[PDB]
Amino acid sequence: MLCAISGKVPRRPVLSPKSRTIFEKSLLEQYVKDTGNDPITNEPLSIEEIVEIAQQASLTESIPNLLTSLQNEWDAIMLENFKLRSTLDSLTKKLSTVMYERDAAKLVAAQLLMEKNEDSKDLPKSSQ
């Protein structure tokens, strides 16, 4: 019901036979020419390998299509990807804080593994 590249609702969906995943024709045809392989599974795929397989009610106030509607579309594309670039940058920063704190904990455990068993060992030796 959607395309597995853009996040569309395809007008001419086409399915690849190597990995069962429906893409919109234009977007899958572009990928194969860029690099001849399936985008998801990274398996060999060509244009001939593909197999070809909706109503939108145009608003009552449909000038606006040139001015207001088209403007909003390129606003919504612009401010989303910019905000999405902001999201990707923080995930990598928050990655570094995760791995550092993880390795910090590893050293605590390693330090405490020597501490505990030797404290237990000392109790076993105390008896003697």
């Binding site: 001015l67 207001t68 403007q71 594309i77 612009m78 910019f82």
Partner: peptide, 17 residues
Amino acid sequence: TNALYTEYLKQRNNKKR
């Protein structure tokens, strides 16, 4: 696109008709 999003300004359309 990146300049439009960073500056927070959409390019003006034809306010004429």
